[PDB]
Amino acid sequence: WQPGVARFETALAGLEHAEEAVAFATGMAAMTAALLAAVSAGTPHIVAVRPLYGGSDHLLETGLLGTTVTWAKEADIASAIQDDTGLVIVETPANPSLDLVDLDSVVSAAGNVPVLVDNTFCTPVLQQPISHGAALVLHSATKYLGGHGDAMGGIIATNADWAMRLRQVRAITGALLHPMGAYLLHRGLRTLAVRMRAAQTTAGELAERLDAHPAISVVHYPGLKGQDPRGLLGRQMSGGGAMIAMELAGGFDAARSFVEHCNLVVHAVSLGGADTLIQHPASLTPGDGLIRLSVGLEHVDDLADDLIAALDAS
Amino acid sequence: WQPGVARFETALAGLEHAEEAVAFATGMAAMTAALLAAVSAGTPHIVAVRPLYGGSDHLLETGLLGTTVTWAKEADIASAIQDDTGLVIVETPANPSLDLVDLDSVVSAAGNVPVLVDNTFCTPVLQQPISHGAALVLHSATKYLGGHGDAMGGIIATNADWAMRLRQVRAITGALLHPMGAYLLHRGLRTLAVRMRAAQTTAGELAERLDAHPAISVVHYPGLKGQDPRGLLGRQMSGGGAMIAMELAGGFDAARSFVEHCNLVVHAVSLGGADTLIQHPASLTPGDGLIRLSVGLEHVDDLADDLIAALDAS
Amino acid sequence: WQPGVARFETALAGLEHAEEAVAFATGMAAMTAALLAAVSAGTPHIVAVRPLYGGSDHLLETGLLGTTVTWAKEADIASAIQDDTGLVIVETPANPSLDLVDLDSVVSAAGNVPVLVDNTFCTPVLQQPISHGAALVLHSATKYLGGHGDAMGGIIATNADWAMRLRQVRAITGALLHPMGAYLLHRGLRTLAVRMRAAQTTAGELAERLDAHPAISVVHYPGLKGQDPRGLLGRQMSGGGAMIAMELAGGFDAARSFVEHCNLVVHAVSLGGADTLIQHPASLTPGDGLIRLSVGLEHVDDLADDLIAALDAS
Amino acid sequence: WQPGVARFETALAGLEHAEEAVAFATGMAAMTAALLAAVSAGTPHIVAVRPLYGGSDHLLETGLLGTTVTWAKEADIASAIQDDTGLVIVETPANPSLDLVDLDSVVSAAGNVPVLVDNTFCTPVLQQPISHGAALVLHSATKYLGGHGDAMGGIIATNADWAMRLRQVRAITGALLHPMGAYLLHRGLRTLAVRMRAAQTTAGELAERLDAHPAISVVHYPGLKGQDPRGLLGRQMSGGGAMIAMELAGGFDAARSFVEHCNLVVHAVSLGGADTLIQHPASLTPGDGLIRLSVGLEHVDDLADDLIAALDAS
């Protein structure tokens, strides 16, 4: 019953072109409510597509909320669907491999089963899952939506029935967004358009410079030459996005050495802000010689000068 | 992983004399986490003592979190305890009737089963359930702890094992307290001692004035003529508390007329803060002619003047 | 033109019984605006009463705003009033010696000259200078008004002409109160009545226990028998207030040793909060063996047990 | 002595390439402190360039702070400088006309007199006055620096001597920035680069479409059709900025009619945010048929379609 939460909810619902949106304390609380809404509806089975986000897959794997998950590849989602399947969870691009998922194909495979798309790294600026047929669109507002991640958040833009169902869970589960945090998110939402466009354009140029260096074997980025065999860019995505994932030829040995030599680019577990970030998945808990990268609002030449110098370690 | 949350957690743990405390977005989120922690531990049965708080009983009644509840009277809790019972939920004084529950007797009846006590209206100022043997002490920080209800909250002061279990649920459930909200709660915690003492002393005088009026049949307030037959005040409670329940002789007809005639005392769903409030549970969704009154910081004389004049108009 | 500032302004104006109030960023900004309003009115002379607050006297002494000050004793204010005198600045009780000033006598001496009273430590709860004839009442909102001092402030409760004059200065001087800071002050204003009453009652008992100890020569608290020869308590003040000053018999040697032995009471430059504070003017920049004390909301017995133990150790 | 203020101060000092910066409550407070620092230094004369910001010229015109102003054109600043001149105030581009001022020429004309440049609309993104020889650079942080104007501000990036002088004034004047407001400004500073670049690029396209319409006589936007005869763009400015001034051929009659027909672009006194704004100096208090523009983060096709349609209706 807060005003700051309502203004942020309708702002994101309009951005995603959804009927309404429901805001929660964190991204985890939004996923929890969506899962609990399916369980309460007498439909606790979830067909989740892998790759999926680190914290989100713990929720399904443990099955704390009384959920049963059957991991299925994108190509065969329909086969995994059971009579009690209530949701089809899918993250695009497939974090942290950055593989593109055809949302139109996923929705047709699900049929009468609602599809939940994690549009966290894409943002409504670079992807509209609702338009492809996704019933629900999940967000972890901390990354990109807020811009700085100082205020945590989680929101699902969906149709009226699923939104009412989510609000009912929120009512007794109590995972509410604080008005101060919602205010910071709605403030950052005004500049989302210019931030994602600038971060995507600097990421595209950065992706070209990374593959040219012999220190890394290849770098994953949808916008790169031949890294979109499906033709999903333009049809589904605005561009290549602001996420770069690269594989080092030196393996785990060169990965940790490359991270410590970076001065401008810093290391963090949560990624997706105004500052450029890197995260070694092997050095946190994925590939051993794999390094993740979230592109910020810095000058492309300043980032390239720092990454190339750190790669020169070998 | 927030600083403002940690400082509020340890402040309340010290007030309740518990090993540590775990803070959640709302009171509902704390109860949800406690219930989910019991379910995850392979013990989903809950022996709850009816009466219970309005929103808390819905969580058990629906059994959204995979819980099985067996409502039992205080006198026979031990009999209702099954092999899979993980918690004994009990609110004292029994909202809304304000019936006193002997915590020492409840803990002995539970035996090896952890006891969760809702100390929301009592606050650590007027009741220490931990000292009586309660394993967990739940709070809805919105009422009394914060002082104004501007910042929502929910916290459980408990031993290290249950606190670690609650933190694990919080980690994937994501029902986190916003640092701004935690700051406002910790700020209000400094003045909790002088607020509850002043509210309790003005409620004790108000309870005497209400029973004297012929408009109401009986007034429920622990610190009154023969209203404490168990000898729980002094032994368990500091005084009579700041809550007063009252049943109007006119039934529902005079009860709603008493609410609409009140100008100073406000009609609200949430009750407990720096102001005096009245709630009619029969008009809201309990008994037909029962009004619940949360004593505030106002002067006893001017507080009696508004209530007595509203009673004069049926 | 902020909403949070307006609600705090009218709340304090009502507390002080003034027509309206003007809020500034800090206490210094309020004094600066009052001084600049007098200078702009073609009346830059100020008759200030000694003693005065540390930072406020620097403003007059330097004469940065184009002011000419004539420091005068309470007894001969009328004689120091020149043709161009626009204000009579006076703080009561005289910080830091705590000497009571008869406001009724000061106003009669000033005559047609407006009187500005620093009611910071007294608060509208324990003193109403407006009722005695003071044209303006200055406050440093951080101390006592806010309760914790987390949000800085400065406000002057005065008549419409002086308030319009102050608003005009604020308009081009730009020393505005931030709405967030004003919100925290207005929130703390709700509990001001119960906090000052509880801090005053605990200070009165603490002063009796302090004089009894042979470690200190003379305790200073206008309230203890004999420390009010003018009969100002009751007539002007509510009680003795929450400020206790004292002089150690051991001089500067015993003064610093007593401060380090305190565990519950902490030392700070700014005072007037929920926690009990102590301040040594000699060890900060007055007398060599003199200590200051801001009584908080702690239990009188808990404060006396720590203070007496610290006094015992020289 | 606040943490949030210090981090914002050093961030802006680095952006402007100044030794240090001093932050105040509002832009007016920063100008007031700069003027008071000159007055206190025994140098109260100010040579200000005509034209100047609306509120800033009132401070000099009234001479509240004990200042004497001699308004002079850019071409003859040196002649207006007297023995007691302590500052040379200059705004570039000269609002409202948007005329470019050669900072290198102004600094040479001032010689030993410190030069204060109001870089509010240019921001460190599009102009570095420090590099041209300006001793002080004033900002009204509300406009552009914050991005939304929700948190007010004022800051001067200057050398160590002038910064120490400003801090000394701030110390007794008390026009402090609230930490919450400073936090919002420092948060918005991270996105300043992408916001000013995007607003400048859409303003450059907008000015081309405005001059083509016969409703307006001549548009004022630095570097549109050889509107920069001095060669100041590139040498001093990054581009044309986000400000466009325009004179209607219909005079005051067409000026008010064009404002009411606008739906997307809104009217306000304070200008410089994420949203596009228009202002009529004649209808507020300059030329009779002149309007200004604060280009925001909207798409150029959305702004042009709205402005051209409003121009069609007189």
Tab-separated table of C-alpha atoms in Angstrom, chain A residues 24-283:
chain	number	residue	atom	x	y	z
A	24	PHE	CA	9.384	-7.277	-4.560
A	25	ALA	CA	12.274	-6.599	-2.129
A	26	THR	CA	14.915	-8.383	-4.304
A	27	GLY	CA	15.063	-10.375	-7.592
A	28	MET	CA	15.031	-13.565	-5.496
A	29	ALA	CA	11.777	-12.520	-3.823
A	30	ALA	CA	10.137	-11.991	-7.239
A	31	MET	CA	11.189	-15.471	-8.415
A	32	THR	CA	10.068	-16.933	-5.054
A	33	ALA	CA	6.622	-15.330	-5.435
A	34	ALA	CA	6.273	-16.509	-9.029
A	35	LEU	CA	7.209	-20.051	-7.982
A	36	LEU	CA	4.863	-19.929	-4.956
A	37	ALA	CA	2.027	-18.615	-7.172
A	38	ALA	CA	2.439	-21.664	-9.451
A	39	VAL	CA	2.657	-24.068	-6.457
A	40	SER	CA	-0.504	-22.540	-4.850
A	41	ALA	CA	-2.358	-22.935	-8.149
A	42	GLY	CA	-1.924	-26.747	-7.839
A	43	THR	CA	0.784	-26.721	-10.501
A	44	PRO	CA	4.233	-27.081	-8.878
A	45	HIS	CA	6.214	-28.397	-11.855
A	46	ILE	CA	8.654	-26.050	-13.607
A	47	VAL	CA	10.408	-26.692	-16.926
A	48	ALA	CA	13.535	-24.613	-16.610
A	49	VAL	CA	15.938	-23.983	-19.419
A	50	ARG	CA	19.619	-24.217	-18.641
A	51	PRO	CA	21.853	-22.067	-18.651
A	52	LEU	CA	20.183	-20.212	-15.767
A	53	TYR	CA	21.356	-17.539	-13.190
A	54	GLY	CA	23.396	-18.798	-10.171
A	55	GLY	CA	20.945	-17.847	-7.397
A	56	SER	CA	17.757	-18.637	-9.385
A	57	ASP	CA	18.841	-22.230	-10.112
A	58	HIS	CA	19.428	-22.830	-6.323
A	59	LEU	CA	15.734	-22.099	-5.705
A	60	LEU	CA	14.625	-24.754	-8.219
A	61	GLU	CA	17.437	-27.241	-7.418
A	62	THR	CA	16.606	-27.263	-3.673
A	63	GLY	CA	12.850	-27.075	-4.267
A	64	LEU	CA	12.323	-25.146	-1.039
A	65	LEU	CA	8.970	-23.763	-2.175
A	66	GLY	CA	7.626	-27.248	-3.056
A	67	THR	CA	8.628	-27.059	-6.723
A	68	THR	CA	9.756	-29.881	-8.994
A	69	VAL	CA	12.145	-28.809	-11.796
A	70	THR	CA	12.984	-30.745	-14.961
A	71	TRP	CA	15.884	-29.066	-16.757
A	72	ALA	CA	15.339	-29.039	-20.520
A	73	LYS	CA	17.339	-27.718	-23.461
A	74	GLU	CA	15.702	-24.936	-25.518
A	75	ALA	CA	15.111	-27.285	-28.448
A	76	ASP	CA	12.966	-29.704	-26.377
A	77	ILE	CA	10.918	-27.753	-23.850
A	78	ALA	CA	7.527	-29.072	-24.914
A	79	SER	CA	8.560	-32.707	-24.270
A	80	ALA	CA	9.498	-31.887	-20.652
A	81	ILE	CA	6.095	-30.242	-20.008
A	82	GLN	CA	3.857	-32.262	-17.630
A	83	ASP	CA	0.153	-31.872	-16.703
A	84	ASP	CA	1.224	-30.032	-13.540
A	85	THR	CA	3.722	-27.685	-15.275
A	86	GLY	CA	2.900	-24.087	-14.354
A	87	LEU	CA	5.900	-22.139	-15.666
A	88	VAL	CA	8.701	-22.277	-18.265
A	89	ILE	CA	11.698	-20.351	-16.846
A	90	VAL	CA	14.147	-19.067	-19.491
A	91	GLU	CA	17.031	-16.518	-19.394
A	92	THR	CA	18.142	-14.783	-22.636
A	93	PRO	CA	20.936	-14.394	-23.527
A	94	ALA	CA	21.893	-17.652	-21.634
A	95	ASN	CA	23.984	-16.262	-18.696
A	96	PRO	CA	27.051	-16.796	-18.624
A	97	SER	CA	27.568	-18.492	-22.104
A	98	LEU	CA	25.499	-15.583	-23.737
A	99	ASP	CA	23.610	-17.866	-26.117
A	100	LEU	CA	20.498	-16.515	-27.790
A	101	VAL	CA	17.125	-18.133	-27.139
A	102	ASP	CA	14.289	-17.732	-29.684
A	103	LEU	CA	11.426	-16.520	-27.473
A	104	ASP	CA	8.863	-16.974	-30.252
A	105	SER	CA	9.897	-20.680	-30.505
A	106	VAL	CA	9.865	-21.157	-26.724
A	107	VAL	CA	6.338	-19.707	-26.376
A	108	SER	CA	5.041	-21.982	-29.183
A	109	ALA	CA	6.654	-25.010	-27.458
A	110	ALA	CA	5.110	-24.107	-24.082
A	111	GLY	CA	1.660	-23.633	-25.626
A	112	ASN	CA	-0.805	-23.146	-22.756
A	113	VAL	CA	2.014	-22.996	-20.136
A	114	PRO	CA	3.022	-19.464	-19.043
A	115	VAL	CA	6.614	-18.449	-19.946
A	116	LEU	CA	8.804	-16.437	-17.509
A	117	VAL	CA	11.733	-14.631	-19.133
A	118	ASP	CA	14.647	-13.187	-17.122
A	119	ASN	CA	15.190	-9.919	-18.989
A	120	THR	CA	17.674	-8.613	-16.342
A	121	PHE	CA	20.730	-8.027	-18.625
A	122	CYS	CA	18.714	-7.125	-21.713
A	123	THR	CA	16.335	-4.600	-20.045
A	124	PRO	CA	13.136	-3.394	-21.831
A	125	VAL	CA	15.517	-1.139	-23.856
A	126	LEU	CA	17.092	-4.085	-25.702
A	127	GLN	CA	14.349	-6.770	-25.455
A	128	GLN	CA	10.552	-7.006	-25.130
A	129	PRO	CA	9.722	-10.616	-24.137
A	130	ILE	CA	6.017	-9.742	-23.635
A	131	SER	CA	5.746	-8.999	-27.390
A	132	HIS	CA	7.089	-12.479	-28.223
A	133	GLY	CA	4.392	-14.156	-26.063
A	134	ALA	CA	6.074	-14.364	-22.653
A	135	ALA	CA	3.440	-14.321	-19.911
A	136	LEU	CA	5.836	-13.041	-17.233
A	137	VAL	CA	9.082	-11.001	-17.442
A	138	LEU	CA	11.346	-11.132	-14.383
A	139	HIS	CA	13.921	-8.500	-13.470
A	140	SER	CA	16.628	-8.070	-10.850
A	141	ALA	CA	16.277	-4.208	-10.703
A	142	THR	CA	19.625	-3.827	-8.908
A	143	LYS	CA	21.477	-4.630	-12.161
A	144	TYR	CA	20.938	-1.947	-14.887
A	145	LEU	CA	17.343	-0.803	-13.941
A	146	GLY	CA	18.636	1.198	-10.969
A	147	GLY	CA	21.939	1.975	-12.670
A	148	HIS	CA	24.108	1.845	-9.560
A	149	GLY	CA	22.700	-1.083	-7.536
A	150	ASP	CA	22.553	1.046	-4.341
A	151	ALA	CA	18.811	0.195	-4.101
A	152	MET	CA	18.003	-3.528	-4.474
A	153	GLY	CA	14.906	-4.647	-6.333
A	154	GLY	CA	12.983	-7.321	-8.138
A	155	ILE	CA	9.954	-6.918	-10.418
A	156	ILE	CA	7.765	-9.064	-12.717
A	157	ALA	CA	5.903	-7.383	-15.615
A	158	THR	CA	2.942	-9.628	-16.456
A	159	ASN	CA	-0.815	-9.862	-17.431
A	160	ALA	CA	-3.594	-9.052	-14.899
A	161	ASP	CA	-4.244	-12.705	-13.786
A	162	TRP	CA	-0.595	-13.502	-13.019
A	163	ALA	CA	-0.145	-10.037	-11.458
A	164	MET	CA	-3.115	-10.579	-9.140
A	165	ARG	CA	-1.723	-14.041	-8.274
A	166	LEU	CA	1.714	-12.488	-7.479
A	167	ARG	CA	0.169	-9.714	-5.365
A	168	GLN	CA	-1.717	-12.364	-3.333
A	169	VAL	CA	1.580	-14.194	-2.603
A	170	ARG	CA	3.283	-10.862	-1.738
A	171	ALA	CA	0.399	-10.129	0.660
A	172	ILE	CA	1.116	-13.087	3.008
A	173	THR	CA	4.788	-13.731	2.057
A	174	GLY	CA	5.612	-10.034	2.904
A	175	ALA	CA	8.607	-9.587	0.546
A	176	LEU	CA	7.859	-5.880	-0.030
A	177	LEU	CA	10.011	-3.243	-1.847
A	178	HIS	CA	10.913	-0.298	0.414
A	179	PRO	CA	9.590	3.024	-0.961
A	180	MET	CA	13.081	4.571	-0.758
A	181	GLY	CA	14.493	1.724	-2.826
A	182	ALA	CA	11.581	1.924	-5.278
A	183	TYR	CA	12.181	5.713	-5.638
A	184	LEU	CA	15.852	5.181	-6.520
A	185	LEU	CA	14.823	2.535	-9.121
A	186	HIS	CA	12.160	4.745	-10.710
A	187	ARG	CA	14.674	7.664	-10.796
A	188	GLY	CA	17.234	5.437	-12.578
A	189	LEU	CA	14.552	4.158	-14.957
A	190	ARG	CA	14.352	7.650	-16.554
A	191	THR	CA	17.990	7.368	-17.733
A	192	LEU	CA	17.799	3.616	-18.650
A	193	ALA	CA	17.353	4.323	-22.342
A	194	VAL	CA	20.554	6.408	-22.749
A	195	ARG	CA	22.589	4.160	-20.432
A	196	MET	CA	21.835	0.829	-22.130
A	197	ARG	CA	22.287	2.316	-25.614
A	198	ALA	CA	25.693	3.768	-24.641
A	199	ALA	CA	26.800	0.577	-22.855
A	200	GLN	CA	25.742	-1.606	-25.808
A	201	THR	CA	27.584	0.541	-28.381
A	202	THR	CA	30.797	0.525	-26.261
A	203	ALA	CA	30.421	-3.256	-25.737
A	204	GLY	CA	30.203	-3.898	-29.494
A	205	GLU	CA	33.501	-2.126	-30.155
A	206	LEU	CA	35.084	-3.831	-27.088
A	207	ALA	CA	34.071	-7.272	-28.344
A	208	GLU	CA	35.928	-6.705	-31.625
A	209	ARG	CA	39.119	-5.668	-29.766
A	210	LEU	CA	39.081	-8.705	-27.473
A	211	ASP	CA	38.977	-11.403	-30.216
A	212	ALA	CA	41.873	-9.664	-32.045
A	213	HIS	CA	44.206	-10.221	-29.044
A	214	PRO	CA	45.953	-13.630	-29.123
A	215	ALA	CA	45.751	-14.025	-25.306
A	216	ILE	CA	42.101	-15.179	-25.533
A	217	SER	CA	40.878	-17.976	-27.886
A	218	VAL	CA	37.412	-16.442	-28.598
A	219	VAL	CA	34.977	-13.941	-27.061
A	220	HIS	CA	31.162	-14.490	-26.911
A	221	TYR	CA	29.014	-11.508	-27.935
A	222	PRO	CA	25.834	-11.836	-30.024
A	223	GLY	CA	26.687	-8.816	-32.173
A	224	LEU	CA	30.075	-10.214	-33.262
A	225	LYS	CA	30.614	-11.533	-36.806
A	226	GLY	CA	28.747	-14.842	-37.158
A	227	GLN	CA	27.649	-14.938	-33.494
A	228	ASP	CA	23.932	-14.821	-34.442
A	229	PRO	CA	23.098	-17.768	-36.711
A	230	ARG	CA	19.416	-17.570	-35.673
A	231	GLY	CA	18.896	-13.966	-36.844
A	232	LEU	CA	17.554	-13.016	-33.407
A	233	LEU	CA	19.193	-9.572	-33.422
A	234	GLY	CA	16.745	-6.976	-34.727
A	235	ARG	CA	13.827	-9.410	-34.584
A	236	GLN	CA	14.071	-9.931	-30.786
A	237	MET	CA	17.057	-7.902	-29.517
A	238	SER	CA	17.986	-4.240	-30.115
A	239	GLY	CA	21.700	-5.053	-30.462
A	240	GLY	CA	24.442	-7.158	-28.891
A	241	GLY	CA	23.743	-6.022	-25.342
A	242	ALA	CA	26.195	-4.877	-22.672
A	243	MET	CA	27.518	-8.315	-21.677
A	244	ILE	CA	30.792	-9.844	-22.848
A	245	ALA	CA	31.990	-13.354	-21.916
A	246	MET	CA	35.534	-14.418	-22.913
A	247	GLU	CA	37.576	-17.626	-22.769
A	248	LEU	CA	41.342	-17.370	-22.071
A	249	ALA	CA	43.878	-19.634	-23.821
A	250	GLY	CA	45.959	-19.894	-20.612
A	251	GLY	CA	43.071	-21.477	-18.684
A	252	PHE	CA	42.590	-20.847	-14.951
A	253	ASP	CA	46.269	-19.781	-14.560
A	254	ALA	CA	45.891	-16.799	-16.947
A	255	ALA	CA	42.381	-15.980	-15.692
A	256	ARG	CA	43.361	-15.047	-12.091
A	257	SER	CA	46.516	-13.225	-13.283
A	258	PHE	CA	44.448	-11.106	-15.739
A	259	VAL	CA	42.009	-10.067	-12.971
A	260	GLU	CA	44.687	-8.789	-10.542
A	261	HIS	CA	46.421	-6.704	-13.276
A	262	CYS	CA	43.206	-4.706	-13.963
A	263	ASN	CA	43.127	-1.255	-12.339
A	264	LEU	CA	40.146	0.457	-14.008
A	265	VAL	CA	37.935	-2.664	-14.222
A	266	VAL	CA	37.065	-4.039	-10.772
A	267	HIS	CA	35.942	-7.515	-9.627
A	268	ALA	CA	32.476	-8.174	-8.084
A	269	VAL	CA	29.975	-11.023	-7.555
A	270	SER	CA	26.898	-8.970	-8.590
A	271	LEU	CA	27.382	-7.425	-12.038
A	272	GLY	CA	25.537	-4.763	-14.058
A	273	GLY	CA	26.116	-1.133	-13.131
A	274	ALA	CA	27.477	2.229	-14.303
A	275	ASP	CA	31.052	0.960	-13.710
A	276	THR	CA	32.633	-1.823	-15.820
A	277	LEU	CA	32.899	-5.142	-13.938
A	278	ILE	CA	34.608	-8.576	-14.355
A	279	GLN	CA	33.799	-11.866	-12.590
A	280	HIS	CA	35.703	-15.114	-12.635
A	281	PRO	CA	33.114	-17.921	-12.113
A	282	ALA	CA	35.788	-20.572	-11.438
A	283	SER	CA	37.509	-18.307	-8.811
